[PDB]
Write a protein that binds this DNA or RNA. Structure first.
Lengths: 490, 526, 306
DNA sequence: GCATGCTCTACTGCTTCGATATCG
DNA sequence: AAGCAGTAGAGCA
DNA sequence: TGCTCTACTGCTTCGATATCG
DNA sequence: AAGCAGTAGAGCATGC
């Protein structure tokens, strides 16, 4: 589903022991859980801001819900992330926050059972949108809540079977009571530890999958194939700057007009023409003629023969390259021809040339279509799309020219020294992780007025190089590498 | 700067010659010249054009004796061209020819440029020369005019007719001469202009000559007339202190027009009697129309809207301390792929000037870097207003120039990656072997590259890097027609446009029976 | 002033509210035309400019419902501010060319909204364009006689009204001129002959034939004064053995009397030298009409009394 | 045989979000 | 609407 | 008389504006 | 471009 969304219930344990400091003086797992919750909401307020969230504490003294069972108390309903809801969730830190929890509910009772899974299910059974993922991240520690009676455990695993009947997926975050894999108890016929990822690897992203265009390619005049033209380097920037009326915190929604032929009144857009002026002579047109003269072809792609992959140099480009793929929605069974043409293009290295008009009215541009094949292994490592890529070519006034009158020689001694320098400064390039300085400091600067913690967190620059960590990686060959064959000496 | 372009025009006797059975060359001549004039007027550049014409039945020349300077008409002078010259060139479709010579047009035009060059700066000049190379000429003076053309510091480009020595329309990625298109005057004139052009320039003189066929589909009408580019100086740094002063120029960019459509109301044919404005109107309710000093530039956050309009972000904005061209590092892996380039312009960091020991140091740098797949990851910015961007610096070792070419790169906010259903392991979408051989015959018989001459360097026609773009051309000719023909509807687009923009139909005739094989072999389409 | 300032802003309104604001600018001009006496000129221009920039264009499908809105808006505005051809034979024929393009069929599409608007435009107002209907009457009659057999309830009786107003408008104009329209009169009368002598089903072709026959029995008495006398004899001799003799008592063919009676009245108003043999047939006819009441329908139940 | 009671699915149109040409 | 370096006219001389 | 400022200036950068699928 | 609903030309069963 495209406009479908994903829910998330955060279940927090507070009966006896997770409120304990583990006889330590570093941190309590309760405030660790509240750290994780506040970080995932401060991430998904700008990353994926239409998911459905909820947070439920179980086991305490009071109970407020819609079914009125004991030891189950919620604070938030399934909704969008609300900045007011996180400004009321941030107060549960420190000793006074623990005291605030203790004097608004306390904790401790003969706590829940199957019934907290029941209130999760009836929390899911009410919201009328579309659902795709339904995960429960439970925050608990112990490995036998059925430490005295077997009917509790039997009805708990039967209730988990009935929740996996409709398939609601729960996978807890186990706390570090041994710091890892030692307490491997019988909490395994319910589900099918790592928290630094949730703490800081979700800073500012966006997620979407649309299509941007659904065109057709014509080979001769009668070979029509239906393709979709996706974009894969979105070139994002900041959300738009809304205008606001001053005091009452409201938008403006301004208007515009045109009038005043030195008589006053109001003129409609029906009496409007366009013009161009050269000195004295002005060529006058109507707007229909202005939009008419940019008409050269139908919307579509036009085949113009083939080419081998040797002349289209990577010096040539003008556009973020798109991606194209066949769909069996318009023309029935065209992926068969596409799979055959893909097979012979990857077997005979050939790449096509085409003429492009994407929208319903546009001057053409020449494109080249390059084949591409997937890569895979056992971990579902799907990293490259099977299909075609569109490189865009310039026409006439783009390739300018330099004055061209410069040529000097060199002498082969510096090749090995430069090899030593590049092998000192050698690294595999990346897989990700060169995040945006301006956007990162902007979203943290917005966060500073959002949650009013203290101040702008200075978002650390990453585009700069570590000058000392390449100074000491280099060494004292800098001055000889300057003046080994070229001394300035003023 | 400023240039003084000269044109030489022949509508002489053989230019009044008939067809071969297809079309006349005189209308091609007038189409080429009117193309040059509309581009060099509608470019709004600062330049002087002069035209000279021979092949009429009059005599307009300050020197004219007998047959020496006979029918040599200096119709035009070195002025800024306007609509008057194109009015004249769609008022000169008459053949109307008496003529004897075409060599002396060059020297009378060069002499009137000698008598014109007073005061202004003319660093460069070009003449485009349109003789017919088949009428009678004379062998009177050659050494003086060769030395004058070598010494005048003015470039020249000559224009042959459509032949050199199937359905040729104007030019369509096809043949020039039908079966044999030469006479004896064409033989002696072509070998004489070949020896003059060889002695003038040399090897580029083999291609310093153009017909009407492929000079229509190439911008070789523009050579040493425009200013080259704009110089960019900076200082490259590697590590702490490897500051080398480096010059750089821009390259291929998505070109755009430089004229604004102007709003004109009806009944006035004017602009200044139009006030176009916006009103700041708080609606929300029954309206209370507000002023501009109520405006908090509020932003969106989740489910609310927050202030910090203007001066707060002027305080806590982002800086990156001036211009910078640093090197992050290098990478020996060739894992920067072909599909992540993401740039609205590409750069050539080139050299410096003024006793370029710095540029021979960069020549040493790139003559080291060129041997292996080791690239550079440059951090670039322009000023404090500019934004920082990392990108690839490709090596480029060539004959005359040694370049490094810089392209931008994505950040890990611009990538997106989602799952696709692959097609190799299919249960319904398997193509069979007769259909495989059909598409193999398709990709055979629809090719464009051909190899020959026993050296196996590739010969490929249809270069979609020299073909001009149709958009500003069609806009310019539609402007000219609505300027002169005062109330007619807009014409159809011209046929030499589609002559430039059409494929060679012989590959379609080669693969027509494959297309029938596809239609009769493959399963259902629609 | 508010709903005239409202539509001159940027093109953002999704066209179906533009339909109702056009019709409101019309209806507001229909009722109370003593407040918009100085600003009823430019509403013509704001309807017409939208008509041009919606209709004359060689690109994009025409915005459909805005045309129906603007057309019935001009229908509401054409009363009380009539710019007829008697002082301006330019804007009138301009509006007529626009409405002829609106009724220009050229295609067999569906959801007949805009030619329905054009039909009732030509119906409810027709006398404003005197001089520019005397040459395209074959074309108008052809497209209307195609539209009256559309097998649609809401469009057929909207076509009939434009048809009858067209005949009633051409009648006075073919009367008041001098002797030049014998071809037009004979062409109309011979097409009415060829329609009254079809025998398959078409009751409506028969009725429109009788109605035009009656409306043209008026201006025939100009020079001849004999064809008038042959007329009404043709009428009774055709009418009597069509409902009074048989299909009189039990049938479905009694839905036709007001046509015959309106025609007989229209010839008898300006007839001279009465025959005085057929009035004992005329009496049996009209008493059969007064008897034949309760198997009727309103909007026919009122014109039977008419 | 003309004017009503009763179903009916394809067409079109508005909203939501995202992408690209534009004057300054 | 904002900045950055090139390129012909003043001011002390 | 040459250097040193100096208002302009082409030309570039995002930025709010407009169009559409 | 996705999607979301609701009108409406178009037929069937029925009365006077």
């Amino acid at each position: 589903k495209y406009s479908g969304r994903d829910s998330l219930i955060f279940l927090v344990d507070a009966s006896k022991a997770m409120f304990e400091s583990q006889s330590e003086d570093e941190l309590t797992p309760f405030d660790m859980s509240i750290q994780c919750i506040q970080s995932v909401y401060i991430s998904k307020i700008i990353s994926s801001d239409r998911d459905l969230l909820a947070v439920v504490f179980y086991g305490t003294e009071k109970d407020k819900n819609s079914v009125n069972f004991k030891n189950i108390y919620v604070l938030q309903e399934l909704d969008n992330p609300g900045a007011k809801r996180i400004l009321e969730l941030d107060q549960f830190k420190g000793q006074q926050g623990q005291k605030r929890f203790q004097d608004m509910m306390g904790h401790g009772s003969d706590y829940s059972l199957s019934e907290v899974l029941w209130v999760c299910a009836n929390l899911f059974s009410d919201v009328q949108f579309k659902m795709s993922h339904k995960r429960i991240m439970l925050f608990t520690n112990e490995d036998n809540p059925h430490g005295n009676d077997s009917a509790k455990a039997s009805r708990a695993r039967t209730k988990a079977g009935d929740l996996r009947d409709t398939g609601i997926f729960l996978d807890l975050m186990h706390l570090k009571k041994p710091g890892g894999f030692d307490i491997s108890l019988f909490y395994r016929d319910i589900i099918s530890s790592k928290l630094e990822d949730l703490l800081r690897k979700v800073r500012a992203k966006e997620t979407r999958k649309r299509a941007l265009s659904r065109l057709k390619l014509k080979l001769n005049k009668d070979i029509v194939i239906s393709v979709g033209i996706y974009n894969l380097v979105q070139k994002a920037l900041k959300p738009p700057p809304i205008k606001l009326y001053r005091e009452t915190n409201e938008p403006v929604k301004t208007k515009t007009r045109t009038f005043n032929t030195s008589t006053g009144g109001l003129l409609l857009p029906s009496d409007t023409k366009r013009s161009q002026i050269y000195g004295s002579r002005q060529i006058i047109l109507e707007k229909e003629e202005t939009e008419e003269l940019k008409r050269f072809d139908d919307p579509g792609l036009m085949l113009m023969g083939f080419k081998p992959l040797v002349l289209l140099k990577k010096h040539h480009y003008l556009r973020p390259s798109l991606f194209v793929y066949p769909e069996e929605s318009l023309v029935i069974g065209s992926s068969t021809l596409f799979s055959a043409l893909l097979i012979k293009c990857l077997e005979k290295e050939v790449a096509a040339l085409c003429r492009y008009t994407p929208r319903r009215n546009i001057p053409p541009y020449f494109v080249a279509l390059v084949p591409q094949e997937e890569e895979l292994d056992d971990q579902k490592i799907q990293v490259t799309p099977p299909g075609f890529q569109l490189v865009f070519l310039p026409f006439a006034d783009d390739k300018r020219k330099m004055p061209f009158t410069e040529k000097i020689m060199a002498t082969p001694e510096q090749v090995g020294k430069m090899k030593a320098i590049v092998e000192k400064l050698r690294f595999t390039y990346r897989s990700d992780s060169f995040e945006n300085p301006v956007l990162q400091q902007h979203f943290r600067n917005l966060e500073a007025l959002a949650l009013d913690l203290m101040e702008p967190e200075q978002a650390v620059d990453l585009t700069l190089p570590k000058v000392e960590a390449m100074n000491k990686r280099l060494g004292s060959l800098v001055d000889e590498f300057k003046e080994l064959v070229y001394p300035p000496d003023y | 700067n400023k240039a003084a372009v000269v044109l030489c025009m022949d509508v002489g006797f053989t230019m009044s010659n008939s067809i071969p059975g297809i079309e006349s060359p005189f209308e091609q001549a007038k189409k080429v010249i009117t193309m040059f004039v509309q581009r060099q007027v509608f470019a709004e550049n600062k330049d002087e054009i002069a035209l000279v014409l021979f092949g009429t039945d009059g005599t307009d020349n300050p020197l004219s004796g007998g047959d020496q300077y006979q029918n040599i008409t200096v119709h035009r002078h070195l002025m800024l061209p306007d609509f008057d010259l194109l009015e004249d060139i769609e008022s000169k479709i008459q053949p109307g020819s008496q003529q004897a010579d075409f060599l002396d047009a060059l020297i009378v035009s060069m002499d009137v440029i000698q008598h014109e060059t007073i005061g202004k700066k003319f660093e460069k000049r070009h003449i485009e020369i349109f003789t017919d190379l088949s009428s009678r000429f004379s062998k009177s003076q050659l050494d003086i005019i060769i030395h004058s053309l070598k010494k005048c510091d003015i470039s020249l480009q000559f224009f042959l007719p459509f032949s050199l020595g199937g359905p040729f329309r104007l030019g369509g990625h096809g043949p020039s001469f039908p079966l044999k298109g030469i006479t004896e005057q064409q033989k002696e004139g072509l070998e004489i202009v070949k020896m003059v052009m060889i002695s003038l320039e040399g090897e580029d003189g083999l291609d310093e000559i153009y017909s009407f066929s492929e000079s229509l589909r190439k911008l070789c009408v523009f050579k040493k007339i425009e200013r080259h580019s704009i110089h960019w100086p900076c200082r490259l740094t590697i590590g702490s202190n490897l500051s080398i002063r480096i010059a750089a120029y821009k390259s291929i960019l998505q070109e755009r027009v430089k004229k604004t459509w102007t709003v004109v109301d009806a009944k006035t044919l004017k602009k200044e009697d139009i006030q176009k404005e916006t009103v700041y109107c708080l609606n929300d309710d029954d309206e209370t129309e507000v002023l501009k000093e109520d405006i908090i530039q509020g932003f969106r956050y989740g489910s609310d809207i927050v202030p910090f309009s203007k001066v707060d972000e002027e305080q806590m904005k982002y800086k990156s301390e001036g211009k910078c061209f640093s090197v992050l590092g290098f990478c020996k892996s060739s894992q920067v792929q072909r599909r992540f380039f993401m740039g609205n312009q590409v750069l050539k960091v080139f050299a410096a000037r003024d006793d370029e020991a710095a540029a021979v140091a960069l020549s040493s740098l790139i003559h080291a870097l060129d041997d292996l797949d080791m690239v550079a990851i440059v951090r670039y910015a322009y000023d404090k207003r500019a934004n920082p961007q990392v990108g690839v610096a490709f090596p480029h070792i060539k004959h005359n120039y040694e370049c490094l070419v810089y392209v931008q790169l994505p950040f890990m906010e611009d990538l997106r990656q989602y799952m696709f259903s692959s097609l190799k392991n299919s249960k319904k979408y398997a193509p069979t072997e007769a259909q495989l051989n059909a598409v193999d015959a398709l990709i055979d018989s629809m090719s464009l590259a051909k190899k020959d001459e026993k050296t196996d360097t590739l010969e490929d026609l249809f270069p979609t890097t020299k073909i001009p773009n149709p958009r500003f051309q069609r806009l310019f000719q539609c402007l000219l027609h609505r300027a002169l023909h005062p109330r007619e509807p807009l014409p159809p687009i011209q046929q030499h446009i589609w002559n430039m923009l059409n494929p060679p139909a012989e590959v379609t005739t080669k693969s027509q029976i494959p297309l029938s094989k596809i239609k009769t072999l493959f399963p259902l389409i629609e | 002033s508010k709903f005239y300032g409202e539509l001159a802003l940027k093109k953002k309104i999704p066209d179906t509210v533009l339909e109702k604001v056009y019709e409101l600018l019309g209806l507001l001009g229909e009722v109370h035309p003593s407040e918009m006496i100085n600003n009823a000129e430019n509403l013509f221009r704001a309807f017409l400019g939208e008509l041009k920039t919606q209709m004359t264009s060689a690109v994009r499908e025409p915005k459909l419902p805005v045309l129906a809105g603007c057309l019935k808006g001009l229908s509401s505005l054409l009363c009380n501010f009539t710019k007829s051809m008697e002082e301006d034979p330019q804007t009138s024929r301009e509006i007529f060319n626009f409405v002829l393009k609106a009724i220009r069929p050229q295609i067999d599409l569906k959801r007949y909204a805009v030619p329905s608007a054009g039909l009732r435009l030509f119906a409810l107002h027709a006398s404003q364009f005197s001089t520019c209907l005397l040459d395209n009457y074959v074309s108008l009659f052809e497209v209307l006689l195609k539209w009256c057999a559309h097998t649609n309830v809401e469009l057929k009786k909207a076509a009939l009204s434009a048809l009858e107003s067209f005949l009633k408008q051409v009648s006075n104009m073919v009367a008041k001129n001098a002797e030049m329209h014998k071809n037009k009169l004979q062409y109309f009368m011979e097409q009415f002959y060829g329609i009254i002598r079809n025998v398959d089903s078409n009751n409506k072709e028969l009725s429109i034939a009788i109605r035009g026959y009656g409306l043209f029995a008026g201006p025939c008495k100009v020079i001849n004064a004999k064809d008038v006398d042959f007329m009404y004899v043709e009428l009774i001799q055709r009418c009597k053995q069509m409902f009074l003799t048989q299909t009189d008592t039990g049938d479905d063919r009694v839905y036709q009397m007001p046509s015959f009676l309106q025609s007989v009245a229209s010839v008898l108003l300006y007839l001279d030298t009465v025959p005085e043999v057929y009035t004992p047939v005329l009496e049996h006819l009209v008493v059969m009409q007064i008897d034949s009441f309760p198997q009727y329908s309103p909007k026919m139940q009122l014109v039977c009394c008419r």
